[PDB]
Structures are given as C-alpha cells and as structure tokens.
Amino acid sequence: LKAGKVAVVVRGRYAGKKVVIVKPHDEGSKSHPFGHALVAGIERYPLKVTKKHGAKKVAKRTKIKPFIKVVNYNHLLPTRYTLDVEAFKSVVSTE
Amino acid sequence: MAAQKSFRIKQKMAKAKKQNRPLPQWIRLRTNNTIRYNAKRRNWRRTKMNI
Amino acid sequence: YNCDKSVCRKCYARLPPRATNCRKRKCGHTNQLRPKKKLK
Amino acid sequence: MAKRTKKVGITGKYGVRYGSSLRRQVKKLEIQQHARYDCSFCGKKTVKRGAAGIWTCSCCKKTVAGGAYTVSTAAAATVRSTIRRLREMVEA
Amino acid sequence: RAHAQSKREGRHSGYGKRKGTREARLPSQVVWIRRLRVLRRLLAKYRDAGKIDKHLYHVLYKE
Amino acid sequence: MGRVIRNQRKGAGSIFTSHTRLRQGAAKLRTLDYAERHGYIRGIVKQIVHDSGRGAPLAKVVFRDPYKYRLREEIFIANEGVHTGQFIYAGKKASLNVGNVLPLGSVPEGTIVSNVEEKPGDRGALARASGNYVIIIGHNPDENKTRVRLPSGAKKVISSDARGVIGVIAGGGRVDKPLLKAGRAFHKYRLKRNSWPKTRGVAMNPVDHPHGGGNHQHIGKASTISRGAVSGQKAGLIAARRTGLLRGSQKTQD
RNA sequence: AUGGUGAACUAUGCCUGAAUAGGGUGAAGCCAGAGGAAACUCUGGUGGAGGCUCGUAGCGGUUCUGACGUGCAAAUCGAUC
RNA sequence: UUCAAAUGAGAACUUUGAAGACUGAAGUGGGGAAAGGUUCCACGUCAACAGCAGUUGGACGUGGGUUAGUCGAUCCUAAGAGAUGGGGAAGCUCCGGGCCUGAUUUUAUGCAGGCCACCAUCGAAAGGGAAUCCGGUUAAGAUUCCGGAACCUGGUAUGGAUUCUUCACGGAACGUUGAAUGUGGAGACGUCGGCGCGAGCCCUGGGAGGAGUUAUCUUUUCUUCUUAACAGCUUAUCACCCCGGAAUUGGUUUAUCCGGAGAUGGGUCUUAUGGCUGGAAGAGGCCAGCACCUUUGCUGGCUCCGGUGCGCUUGUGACGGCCCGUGAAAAUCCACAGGAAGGAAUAGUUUUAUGCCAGGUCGUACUGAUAACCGCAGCAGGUCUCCAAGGUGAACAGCCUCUAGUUGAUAGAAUAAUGUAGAUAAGGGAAGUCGGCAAAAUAGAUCCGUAACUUCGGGAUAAGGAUUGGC
RNA sequence: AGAACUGGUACGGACAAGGGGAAUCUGACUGUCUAAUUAAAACAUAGCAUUGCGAUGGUCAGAAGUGAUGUUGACGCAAU
C-alpha cells in the first residue's frame, strides 16, 4: 500500500526510455550520482537493456525495440521466404 | 591538511627548530674554550630556514 | 567543477555541502550557505 | 520586413565594413543553413545544423551528413544520379 | 520604512529622482514578462468558463 | 649568421604539433573477413560526430559480425547523403550505394569514389579531405590496372584490389566562405599541426629571416630558390619555375 | 672555448579549473492589421545577435613629461586614461 | 585621539571606561590555497630588536598546545614523467604467460584442467570521489575529543520472513538461483540567452518575548521570534509518456514550437529537492528578575500567523540559439541479458533485522598579510580562492549597523617665506604654452528634435532646446 | 504617468555624472609591442595570389631509432 520507484525519463541520449522497478535497496532508483537502486524491465520481448537510477538516466525504447526485433523478424521471414521462392524458381525452371 | 603536509618534510622542518635552540648553561661551565655564542641560531624575520 | 565546502552567508564559517545548514554559534538552520564557486 | 532596408541576414555582426561581396557569401551559406528544411524521413520542417556537416532532425532524431553550410548541394545530388545510372545499366 | 510607506503613495519617482535610466527601471522586458503571463492565464480562464469561441480565441490569442 | 628561422622551428617541439589527443582517430577502412556477398559486414549509422582532425564529419557505425577474430567498428568516414539508419557494407560483393566500401575492380566506371587505397590493406589513402573526390575513369575488366583521377587532377595508376568508398566526403564547400576574423581562424588553428599568428619574413629583422632587414620592408634578394638549398636558406618561392599569375596551365606529366 | 645548471621570473603551448556588478544599443527571423493572384510589401510588435557600446570584478599602462629620484620601491604613488 | 583611571622604579604610545572617527568586494570583516616552520598559548625578563619610549610585543628565555572510519591525503585517470624489445651512442644519453578453477575438503593440502588481449606505476592535497551532524568543552584543538543522535566501508552470524518445479500487482506502463558469455549506464563534462520548482534573504503587518528613550510629543523605533544529518511520510514539478483513451485548425509558450508515425479532454505512469510536512526532538543549552562565596538552579521566549518585491541568487530541472572552433578520461556503484547446473518432512537463494570484528596510514597549531608569504627590513610593491544577500543608493558615488575589525612606530609648541597636495578669484577670455597642456567645463533621465557622408549596418546620446523639488 | 499650491539663488540641488562641431593624414576594425624612457602609422588580421607537395609526402627535429608531417591528405599541409 505504498508510493515509489524505477525511472523513465527523457530524451537526451540514445532513445528511451521505459524500464520496470525490481523495488528500492537503499533509496529508490531515483536519479543522482552513484546508482544505488534498480531497474529491469520484465524481460523477454520489450527487450529492455535498461537504466537504473539513482543515476539520471537512459533506456533504449520499449515499443520501438520489439518493433525493431519483430520488424527485423518480419523483414527476415519475407526476405527468407523470397530467397526460398527465388531458390524454388531457379532450381525448378530449366534443366 | 594543510600545510606543507608531507610527512617526511614536516619532520625535517620540526627537527630543525629544536636543533636551533640555545645552549645548556653547563657547557660554558665545564668548559672547553669559547665565548660560546652557539652560532647556529636561526632567526625570526631574518635569514631563512634553509632552502 | 562542483562540490567544495559551503561558506556561511552570516558567520562566514565553512561547513559542508552535505550539511544542509550553517553554524558557527547558534546559526542553527539559518541555511545561510553558499557553496564555493569551485575555484579560480 | 525587419526595420531593415536591404538585407543583412547576418550582417549586423560585422557592423559596417567587410564589403558587399565578402559579406554576401557569408550571408548565403549560413542563412540557408538556418532555413527550415524538410527531413527526408518525416517530412516535417525540422532540420537544423548540429555542427558543421552534421544535420539532425528535431522530430525523428535521425542525423545525417550533408554540406557544412547547407544540408545538401547540387554537387552531392549530381554524384547520386550518376552512380544510380551506372548501377541501372549493370543490373538491366 | 518611512521612505517605503511614502512610496505607496506615489513619490520619489520624480523627473529628478528616477535615475537609473528609463529602461533600467522597467525596460519593458520585465513588464512584458509580467503581462505575457497574465494574457495567457486570463485566456485560459475565458476558455474554461466558456465565453467566446475556439476560433475567436485563436484570433485573439494571436492578437 | 641567424637565430633559428620559423621553418626550422617546426622541426619538432610541443609548439609545432597538434593536440593529437583531442583527435578522435583515424577512420581508415577495415580489412574484409572475406566475401561480403551482402551483410557480413552490416553497419547501421547511429550517429554523425565532428572530427577536429580534418574539419569534416565522421559517421559512427556499428558492425556486429562474428567470430574470435571478428574485427568490427568504428568511425569510418562520412560521405554526403549518409545518415543515421542507413546501412553500410564494406567489401567485394557490397551493393553500389553511396557509403558502401569496396575494391575499385568491383566499382563501375565513371563513379565518384573517395577514400581509395594506394596499396591493398593500407586502408584508404586517397581523396580524403572534405568535398574532395576521386573519379575512377577506367577499369574494363582490368586484372592489371585501375586508372583513377585524383582531386588534383593527376591520373594515378593504382591496383584494382584497392578499396574505396562510393561518393564524395561530406562537408564540402567548406573552403568557399572566408573565415572573416582572426578569432575564427585562431580556434581552428588550435586543432591542427600549426603555430599561428604568422608574422611576415619582410616584417622581421635580418637575423629572424632572409627576407628581413632594411629600413623599408622588402625582400632584399629574389625568391625563386635553388632546390639544393638548406632548410633555413629556402624561404619564399621554393624552386618555382615561373611566377606571376596569369597563364600556364598544364598538367606536366612525366 | 668545454661541461653542466636554471621555464618558481618571463615567452608560448597544453591539460585542468574559475571569473566577468549593472546598463544601453539592437542583427536572425516571427505575430497582428493592412496592401498583394504571387513574389513579396508597410506598419505596429516581439525576441534577442555582436572579437557591440557605456561601465563593475579583473586586466592594461596614455598623461601630469606632477610626487619620488642616498626612494616606501634596483621602476613606487595620485589624478588622468 | 582626548580625558579620567588601572599598574609600574619609570607611562603620549600597556590596559580599563567614556567620548570620537575610520574600515565597507574589505586603502583595517570572516574562513582558506600556496608559502612560512612554531611565529600559536602561558609566564617571566628588557642586554640586544621594534627606525622613539615600552610596564608592551611576534625580542629573549622557559614550558605547553595541534587528538579523525565519517575533513582531506590515501584511490583514480588527464596534459605526459614515461618502466618497457630493438637500435644509434664506447658512454652519459635518446625513442619506440597473466587470470579463473575442478578430485580432497572446509583446515587448504593436493593431483589435474580450463579463458585472454594490447601491457606498470605516477600524475590535480583546487578534476572525479564511499560515510556526520548538534551543540558542549580548552589558556592553546575541534564537523577530529566528548554527550546525544546518525551513517559508511571492508570481509561474517542468524530467528523473523518471504519467495521455493527461481514472484503477486496493474488492460499497460508498472509494482512490492546461477557457472561458461556478450553488451551498457552512472561517474560524464562547451558557450549564449533561458522559463519554472524552491529555500534562505531583504521586508512588512497582526504579534510573543527583551532594549534604547522624553528643554518639549506622539507614537517611535529597536535586539528578537533557533534548530541537524537524516528515520519515514508527498498535494508530487518539468520531461519523456510513439500508455490507454480520445479522433482536431486546434492546442500552446517568455520565445521557438507540437499534432493527425494521431492535438486538446482525461483514467494512469515515471519522477527533483540544500524542497513542503512529519518525526528526529518533553534532544540540547543563553538573556530576565531571584538565590548562592562558587558549584549550582527557575519558568517563558524555543511548538508565532500570513504574505508581498519575479531580489531567477545557488541546487536542480526545461529548451532554443551556437561554432571551417564540437566541448577529457578512469576507479567504482549497479543493470540488461544468456544460461550449463541445482530445487523430495531434505535442501536452496534475496533480505529486514540486529549482531559481529575492524577501520591498521599521514595531516590538523597559527599567520594567510600596510607586522609570520615573496622581495636584503615590522618594504605604500607583488601574489590565488570563497563570502556578488548586510541596510539606504544601483548612474557612481557617499553614509551607515546588532558581523566584526583598528587607531600604523614618534611626539610637543607654532603656523614666516620657500615647497608639496589643494580651492577660489575681479573683468577680459588662449593673448599663454611646442601643443588649450591641465584644470575648469558638460553631466542623470524624459519629452521633442537630429546634418554631411555612408559598405544604409551606421553616422547618433550628432547637433539644438525643454523638463525634473517638497508634497 | 498626470494635477495641485507654493518655496529655494539653485530641484543631475550633495557627491558622482559626455564638453560639442568641422577639415586633413595614416591604419578597415576588435586585437598585439620594446617586463624597467617608443602603444605608433609598427605587428597581427580576414580577403586576394604563386609555389612546392600523390605519401615511406615535401617540409622541419635527428647518428640511428624514430619523431614532427598524419592516425592526415591537392576543398589539404608547407614556404612566401
């Protein structure tokens, strides 16, 4: 039943940023000098490389990373399928 | 800190101050020979403790 | 660049930046601290 | 316009001197660097000069190479067309 | 205190007195800083009370 | 005789060098694992950052390709039109797109290239500066030779195995506008291997330069100098031939 | 003439730090109205640019060819700049 | 300085009081860096010193004083001193495997196996950095000691948990094991202008507490009204929010802008502080009448009430404008992953929590300057920082007030010319002098007005004139 | 900002606080100089040019290393 503390932020930087709070160890994960407290984000498909804080602050972007991987996979499945069709046509064609 | 903090240096400058002190009455008295004006005497404004 | 010690605007006594507040004598959360502008 | 008569752009910096020709060049490249340019990607009139030869889009944040003073030139556009002409013929 | 209580209350704001300069008093930069904040705040109150229209507010905002 | 003259002072000494450590680097072109039939070198430009070392931009590219040895990254040379999110491929079977790096043999005739190797694996020697460019005139299938036209206008005969990057280097038309201020010129000088401001030789005393001395400022002597001449003796117009201004021409050519 | 020995002064450099009261002036180009088919324009405005001007910390050293000239000082002091 | 007075063999300069000035970004405040090298503090001497006395002092002599897990050095890396092949030079001189384990076993012995790139130390006592304040005490130390309270760093102990086929929550954002292996943030970094958060300040009143004060009066007007790191609560700003949800010529700033790669509404989120609270804290010492030789001890003020002036000042946090010029780098805190392997009344982690030992290094005095630094000197000189919020002025200046600091090493009596700083001069007005040199002169600011020339930017505060109080 | 009634010789009342105009010479400007008799017209300046230089660059330090050139480059660097 309490308040508290992750990061998101900002946009200098590198893209970000969304990441999730594993809790607060000694303070929250709350911009400063030295990072004390904690980030994750829950793990597999926003794929967040992250930022903790206590330290003022950067993630790579949560929607955009699944879209970069899903669209990469989506690019791949079509490039491979085209290469697969291309391979079918070329082998099949003459003699 | 400060000054001048280096441990080794500090000691030498401290050591020197005591070494520059007046004589003990006695050496004049058991006596060798000497209108005993120490000489080493080092001084308030004047001279320099040594470069 | 930054943190020095913080110099009292009333008494003029240098106390920490990590202290919020000043005292030389009963200044006692007069808060009257300026950090040093960090050197020259 | 401004309270200006002809057109300084930059000129006020100079004060008085420098001469028509010298100040004109220095006016042209920088005022055209400042001019709102569409990013190729978004199409918003974003582009600003980050540094000489560095151009950045405020909206997309894609950064791109170009001329120092201007985002682009004629010269760069000529090079891109000829390589493409060569490339087309080879491909067929 | 007496000089300030005598400045509620006009004065010591004479032609002779005013120095520093017309624009060191009030360059109009500072006056613009007060006023520009008033204008957008009053416009916000006008909108929320529902006076005047969204189209009229744009022309007026711009004005 | 003299005091040492300025040229002789360049020599070595801290006052003469550049502040090498403010330089980001080289940006020599890597040395292919092999193949590169599309994207065993795949780069994405993620950024464009200025080099103080050539007053032109670099492109940060990464490069992710494997093994143990793998070699990857870094700051290769930016071309005009190269941008963040655009792909770089570096090697033999790369596509012929601007910013992609390949041997001259693989390049089509009549395409502007920059950053060309004198000798293979030397990583890129030629055309080089901002808005400068090579034009590869000739190939054919030449096993033997690729004929490249430099930015000076000399035709160099270099090996077809020499890599180069397609396009001209970014930041061109940098020469065009004049600095207009001593102050602008100064900060730029701090970047490079230079002492300045520069006083004239004629402005100087005879002890400081051959051009010095005399009540009125003048070169006492001629300028056009004997090529054998020592460093100290050689100032002014070095081994010139002709002087003024207003004629000549030509590509000379051995 | 030979060998060392001084960049605590000072010259220039580099790295790393910091300082510049207050004010005037008035560039980019943008908003209103009004001209205008447009290109553009005028007029109010706003925002502030500059090896920017008046001047403070600071830095400099023109002038009295002043004081001093066995000095306070082996180049100082005021008033001026 | 003067004037009483203290003391002394001796008093213009030692000291007490009174009365008077002066110092004011420090021609004399506070606290330090370098440097000095004990100058500090006490006491007692006065031959020598202090350009003079001298009871005095910073002379002299004789003791004493500086207390660090939490300040700072140590550590790091920077411009490179550069160890460091090989090679010149006889030579001096000079450039360019190491790391991690598994049988045993919990003592670490012991046999045996596996990884990996460009390598040392030093270099800023003012880069960066793990942690501490409150007041109390000394003759002389103090964020060190102490009384209270807190916290850290390094390398373990254990009930109470939880969570146990390695987590519920919230549509979402988010929220309250672990080897081989890759990759990263923080630290971390320009300049201009630049809004907002907010504090302490200046300030005022209603007001609580305690001072000054009337030839004559009305209130006056005054010192003040204190509180820590940092427990844990916060209404939680901006910025992101390609959150959901909505579906647009509308939204919106100081300015630029933003949007239909979905604007405003409007259910959320993240998330700052030297921040507001709330507690730390009925923690704690001084003035006012009173007692006491002193030690001691007494209640109340410390449990005030609201705000203004943009005073954008610092700590922080938007951004726009900016360079042929692009604004360092590391140790260290921490994290994403990507996984062999290990989960049975056994056994396995992650901690709160409170312990549990330690913390082993060297510095701390004082001056920091018209008297302890440098310059031969008790040298009108030079030489860095912070205090840019003291009060009226902000055009500079002057004067102040509870900070606080001082009266320089010569005095007395008089007052001529000469001289050195300095003012004012009839009326005339550059005649003087190389030269209008100086000095006078003009002066702020508003209104009105403003020529030639010009690269139309300027010239320009042209010029000229007018105006300004006290209320 | 505006008005009042009225005083003073004076209302920037003190102190501080630009005297203005024209002709000519030079050097475009801001900047730099003889630390201690020259701050100027001298120097720098940015503009404009010629010349060398294709890379183990030429050019400069240097016995060699190796440095400096350049981790750059004929839109650049050097010399004038």
Curated annotation (Swiss-Prot), chain A:
Region forming the signal peptide: none
A single BP term in Gene Ontology: cytoplasmic translation
Subcellular location: Cytoplasm
Keywords: Cytoplasm, Ribonucleoprotein, Ribosomal protein
Primary role: Component of the ribosome, a large ribonucleoprotein complex responsible for the synthesis of proteins in the cell. The small ribosomal subunit (SSU) binds messenger RNAs (mRNAs) and translates the encoded message by selecting cognate aminoacyl-transfer RNA (tRNA) molecules. The large subunit (LSU) contains the ribosomal catalytic site termed the peptidyl transferase center (PTC), which catalyzes the formation of peptide bonds, thereby polymerizing the amino acids delivered by tRNAs into a polypeptide chain.
Note: Present with 7380 molecules/cell in log phase SD medium. There are 2 genes for eL27 in yeast.
Family statement: Belongs to the eukaryotic ribosomal protein eL27 family.
Subunit note: Component of the large ribosomal subunit (LSU). Mature yeast ribosomes consist of a small (40S) and a large (60S) subunit. The 40S small subunit contains 1 molecule of ribosomal RNA (18S rRNA) and 33 different proteins (encoded by 57 genes). The large 60S subunit contains 3 rRNA molecules (25S, 5.8S and 5S rRNA) and 46 different proteins (encoded by 81 genes).
The protein's name: Large ribosomal subunit protein eL27A
Span within the parent record: 5 to 99 of 136
UniProtKB/Swiss-Prot annotation, chain C:
Compartment list: Cytoplasm
Glycyl lysine isopeptide (Lys-Gly) (interchain with G-Cter in ubiquitin) crosslink, residue number(s): 5
Function: Component of the ribosome, a large ribonucleoprotein complex responsible for the synthesis of proteins in the cell. The small ribosomal subunit (SSU) binds messenger RNAs (mRNAs) and translates the encoded message by selecting cognate aminoacyl-transfer RNA (tRNA) molecules. The large subunit (LSU) contains the ribosomal catalytic site termed the peptidyl transferase center (PTC), which catalyzes the formation of peptide bonds, thereby polymerizing the amino acids delivered by tRNAs into a polypeptide chain.
Subunit structure: Component of the large ribosomal subunit (LSU). Mature yeast ribosomes consist of a small (40S) and a large (60S) subunit. The 40S small subunit contains 1 molecule of ribosomal RNA (18S rRNA) and 33 different proteins (encoded by 57 genes). The large 60S subunit contains 3 rRNA molecules (25S, 5.8S and 5S rRNA) and 46 different proteins (encoded by 81 genes).
Protein name: Large ribosomal subunit protein eL40A
Organism expressing this protein natively: Saccharomyces cerevisiae (strain ATCC 204508 / S288c)
Gene that encodes it: RPL40A
Portion held of the full protein: 89 to 128 of 128
UniProtKB/Swiss-Prot annotation, chain E:
Compartments it resides in: Cytoplasm
Stretch list, region Disordered: 1-22
Modified-residue entries (Phosphoserine), positions: 28
Keyword annotations of the record: Cytoplasm, Isopeptide bond, Phosphoprotein, Ribonucleoprotein, Ribosomal protein, Ubl conjugation
GO cellular component: cytosol; cytosolic large ribosomal subunit
Disulfide bonds: none
Gene Ontology molecular functions: RNA binding; structural constituent of ribosome
One of the GO BP terms on file: cytoplasmic translation
Annotated family: Belongs to the eukaryotic ribosomal protein eL19 family.
Annotated function: Component of the ribosome, a large ribonucleoprotein complex responsible for the synthesis of proteins in the cell. The small ribosomal subunit (SSU) binds messenger RNAs (mRNAs) and translates the encoded message by selecting cognate aminoacyl-transfer RNA (tRNA) molecules. The large subunit (LSU) contains the ribosomal catalytic site termed the peptidyl transferase center (PTC), which catalyzes the formation of peptide bonds, thereby polymerizing the amino acids delivered by tRNAs into a polypeptide chain.
Miscellaneous note of the record: Present with 97700 molecules/cell in log phase SD medium. There are 2 genes for eL19 in yeast.
Listed name of the protein: Large ribosomal subunit protein eL19A
Organism for this UniProt entry: Saccharomyces cerevisiae (strain ATCC 204508 / S288c)
Lineage: Eukaryota, Fungi, Dikarya, Ascomycota, Saccharomycotina
Swiss-Prot record, chain F:
Cellular component per GO, a single term: cytosolic large ribosomal subunit
Main location group: cytoplasm
UniProt GO BP: cytoplasmic translation
rRNA-binding as UniProt keyword: yes
Pfam families recorded: Ribosomal_L2 (PF00181), Ribosomal_L2_C (PF03947)
Subcellular location: Cytoplasm
PANTHER family noted in UniProt: LARGE RIBOSOMAL SUBUNIT PROTEIN UL2, RIBOSOMAL PROTEIN L2
Quaternary structure (record): Component of the large ribosomal subunit (LSU). Mature yeast ribosomes consist of a small (40S) and a large (60S) subunit. The 40S small subunit contains 1 molecule of ribosomal RNA (18S rRNA) and 33 different proteins (encoded by 57 genes). The large 60S subunit contains 3 rRNA molecules (25S, 5.8S and 5S rRNA) and 46 different proteins (encoded by 81 genes).
Descriptive protein name: Large ribosomal subunit protein uL2B
Source species: Saccharomyces cerevisiae (strain ATCC 204508 / S288c)
Upper classification of the organism: Eukaryota, Fungi, Dikarya, Ascomycota, Saccharomycotina
